[model samples]
Target: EEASSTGRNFNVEKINGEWHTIILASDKREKIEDNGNFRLFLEQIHVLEKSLVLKFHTVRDEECSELSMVADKTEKAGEYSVTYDGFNTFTIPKTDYDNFLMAHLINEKDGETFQLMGLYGREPDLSSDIKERFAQLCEEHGILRENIIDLSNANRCLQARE
Candidate 1:
């Protein structure tokens, strides 16, 4: 089953005249996709209408949020990358959807890369946990996320330092 990949599954049901369910799946090849300075990725999204149900295999990851770039000030330092897979869910007021999209564009226009590497070294485990949380948030807000760019392995070299 798809849920096996994430070590979890969704339970479907109806509540208050709505259908609700939790669904989990995996995308082994899913990666962050970058367009110029903009980057997009996938996150699990859930739709709460009739019953709560997770849209398994939903492609909600987008470059709506600004990307924070990983700083590499050293001239001799080579480019580095980071990669990982996880889950996430969240709950939004539903009215903030448009604002969320606009804010994302503003950040992207400013040339942010969502600097995932900055959070590296400081707390590698936390970084992974945050990624999973983002996934869950995407699901709760009914946002469709998809694997955009492949996270490069440049960051792995830094991790090896430890």
Candidate 2:
């Protein structure tokens, strides 16, 4: 659980059995080079494949033996910017589909105290957009963690108590 002791970290794993955004860092003692190094910004990546339109660049299962070289690249997926630094795992088309993972980084740039956006997994009827964030301390007496968005300043939280 405790991978990095600093900032700039996003992770999801299975290594999830025949699926795999998955941008990586945080090894050089809680890495965060500050305003430089570590860059990757692939905003939206939607893959709900059932053979609607993906004009056969490559993905033939005529043969099989775990010959996966980081799966498929999606050929720069959507907005052909192609920005990366080190450590990448952008493979999402393997016949069992429905992956809508997105990404970002560029050191995150503070972004008003952490708000990078975009991360997903578990779909195709099992259904899950990935939500289990936390902030429930104080002996867990006031648990309010439905993905945590407690903007309770409703005009200074109305004391009417009605």
Candidate 3:
């Protein structure tokens, strides 16, 4: 299996009788970054057995985090700080962050992006997990029942021994 971003292909192959979690990176990320795009920094990649965790770093005083979590309503994280090595990391609940993630991950694509893949047979629940994560997003965006592969599939031909 595979997914792509920025004209790059990422493969998900089963190894050791299990999914190794394939990751892909951009072949031309510097171009986007140099063009004043901050998001180009994320190259291709993947994760596993995880419930779609979203983490980002900003200038510590960012209200973006707070704004992003407005959907969480009453139980959202306090205006707190957790500085680490001059950087900070904060946590938002899975339920609370769901809507925010949907608006971004479910109906989106870009080069130098990150994707998650699990071995088809090895990780039996992987596809379902991905689907469930995006379920709400798909419904809200009116993209339900659409195949995720069409959104991002491996550029298999590129992997051929050219």
Candidate 4:
């Protein structure tokens, strides 16, 4: 299936709040591997008046550092224009708001294009069914199964600040 919005309408507000990065798949491993520029640990999503704010965490100097990105709303309901990791167009293809969601990113850098997909959940752990669903979605998008990283046991210092 294409990474487009689900038949159900996209509710930006319902998706607002804390989220855990469950899995990530990318066309190129270099982008999502450890120390990769796109290896992001998402924390929270804030729905602003006309845009979305994503809070991420990464390890630097042996500690977790927070980073924020502003995604400008696009003409489409589930898409946004973000300027990180090259010029990127981010979209939420599927979401139930309360449980799980799949996010896709198309990035263009140095005349080359790459795709990254992520499965995020409201809680740290998700059902096996949801995880498998995300795997299938990644395969459909041409991301090899091996390239998918499970971040459930990853150390992103999620609770460091709190």
Best model number under lDDT:
4
Worst 10 residues of 3 by lDDT: 66-75
Summarize candidate 3's per-residue lDDT along 1-162 as a digit string, tens digits: 322211234211211122111111222223112222222111111222222122321222322221111111121221122222222222221212111111222111333232222112222123456446555433443432432332112222112111
Root mean square deviation (Cα) for candidate 3: 15.5
- Could you give candidate 2's per-residue lDDT for residues 1-162 as a string of tens digits? 222211233122311232222222232212222333222222122332211121111112332122212223333332112222433332222112244332222222224222222232223111222222212121132322322321111111112111
Candidate 3 lDDT (Cα, whole model)?
0.23
Write model 1 residue lDDT over 59-136, tens digit each, in one string.
Answer: 234213322222221211112121212112211111112111100101111332221211111122223443454456
What are the runs in model 3 whose C-alpha is more than 4 Å off?
Answer: 1-127, 150-153, 156-162
What's the residue-level lDDT of 18 in candidate 2?
Answer: 24
- TM-score per model over all chains: 0.23, 0.21, 0.21, 0.88
| Steric overlap count per candidate | 40, 0, 4, 0
Q: Which stretches of candidate 1 lie over 4 Å from their true place?
A: 1-35, 38-121, 125-130, 140-143, 148-157, 160-162
Q: Write the per-residue lDDT of candidate 4 for residues 40-154, one digit (tens) a residue.
A: 7888988885777888777886777877988887765577888886878887877767788788888988899999899988887688989998988888878887777787646
- Global CA lDDT of candidate 2, please? 0.24
Residue 160 error, candidate 3, Å: 9.6
